[PDB]
Design a protein around this ligand. Structure first.
Ligand SMILES: N[C@@H](CCC(=O)N[C@@H](CSc1ccc([N+](=O)[O-])cc1[N+](=O)[O-])C(=O)NCC(=O)O)C(=O)O
Ligand SMILES: N[C@@H](CCC(=O)N[C@@H](CSc1ccc([N+](=O)[O-])cc1[N+](=O)[O-])C(=O)NCC(=O)O)C(=O)O
Lengths: 217, 217
């Protein structure tokens, strides 16, 4: 089987776990544990960081037979290509690229708050702008069923994830944008996904390490 | 022709300016200026940010007739597909995905440092990490002439860029790595690139905006 490595948290690997399940990939997980405050030990990871044969060691990582990958985005693309979940036309490919990249940007702005020690003072305002990001997703999506075009591609897994996290941080966000509420239910409604979500394997929260200020436990 | 907008700086758009050149693309640029301390005016950009017909407005952006792209990496990829600068086999495609993403990681680390109000005191720390970074790049490339295999592809434009900025920041960071200094010469050595570097269009520094601690001019 394949091996997926990451922190025993949701964080930025949600999209990959969803995808392995969607493609019915034969995989195993290694979920590393950090230590508690004050030191939050990383030894479980660090003891083996440099012993797996990875080009640029990091988490998440993926081992598949002789193939070893790091960089969450690269792992996504590799599975996309293996099960043919990419865009078919130049139009689709260009939407996919944009969305891949956008999600990363929004994921990071989030972290950095949820990691910003003034999480609170910063909060009110941060979520002052949560709306406008959401609006960008909505108009991009329009009336299509999937982000890239006619069928499901890798990017929907990425879009699903940040939109889910958003409506966790500001439940009242999804509100003005019904096409975003429907996407989330259509994604949640894919057979293989529905089953995963009720499984023992599923890990929705926490999103960050105990180090965070939100979804840290 | 094609239009490229970005700050009148190196920033993250160096790879694009280079690829447009290598490919003999007809294009013009809009180089937005930024006010000076203590307020750093952004209005030349802000006045049109929402009037270009872009899906997720940002800098840089590429208008190619009816195709409007944002996200530096998606612009890099649209150019690569158009000019056949992609990996040709699975191997090359995985190599490229990894490097693309790793570059962005190493670019963000530098930005975070150089924007930190504690530049002076934090630098010594950052300095210590360079040797490790460079080693990973050296060993990945090994003895191949370019990042993905026997042929130039778009990731070489991104790799060049990052390796060139770290070298500017820490002149002695590449001394222990032969293959990296050679890779830099091979790339600067390409016909269309030597020619552009001497042009009135060349812009190597500043690397950052006037609100950074290093190379803000
Ligand atoms: N660009 C890479 C980012 C991977 C990454 O940063 N991994 C973090 C987890 S996420 C993360 C992402 C960004 C930041 N951050 O502070 O900017 C912190 C974390 N984190 O885990 O705490 C990790 O713990 N790496 C193992 C290692 O470095 O040895 C990817 O997309 O795969
Ligand atoms: N993912 C994007 C990042 C685009 C971006 O953040 N652009 C900046 C300049 S670079 C930059 C600027 C700020 C930060 N930042 O972390 O605050 C990071 C970067 N960067 O290059 O990573 C900009 O000025 N945008 C104009 C706007 O938003 O209206 C891209 O790859 O194109």
């Amino acid at each position: 089987p394949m091996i997926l490595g990451y922190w025993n948290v949701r964080g930025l690997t949600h999209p990959i776990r969803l995808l392995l399940e969607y493609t019915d990939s034969s995989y195993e997980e290694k979920r590393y544990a950090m230590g508690d405050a004050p030191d939050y030990d990383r030894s479980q990871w660090l003891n083996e960081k440099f012993k797996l044969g990875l080009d640029f060691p990091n988490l998440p990582y993926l081992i598949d037979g002789s193939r070893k990958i790091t960089q969450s985005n690269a792992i996504m693309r590799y599975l996309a290509r293996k099960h043919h979940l990419c865009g078919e036309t130049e139009e689709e490919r260009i939407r996919a690229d944009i969305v891949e990249n956008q999600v990363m940007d929004n994921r990071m702005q989030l972290i950095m708050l949820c990691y910003n020690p003034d999480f609170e003072k910063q909060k009110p305002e941060f979520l002052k702008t949560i709306p406008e990001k959401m609006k960008l997703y909505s108009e991009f999506l329009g009336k299509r069923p999937w982000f890239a075009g006619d069928k499901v591609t890798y990017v929907d897994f990425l879009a699903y994830d940040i939109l889910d996290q958003y409506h966790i941080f500001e439940p009242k966000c999804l509100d003005a944008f019904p096409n975003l509420k429907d996407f989330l239910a259509r994604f949640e409604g894919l057979k293989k996904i529905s089953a995963y979500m009720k499984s023992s394997r599923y890990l929705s929260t926490p999103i960050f390490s105990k180090l965070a200020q939100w979804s840290n436990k």
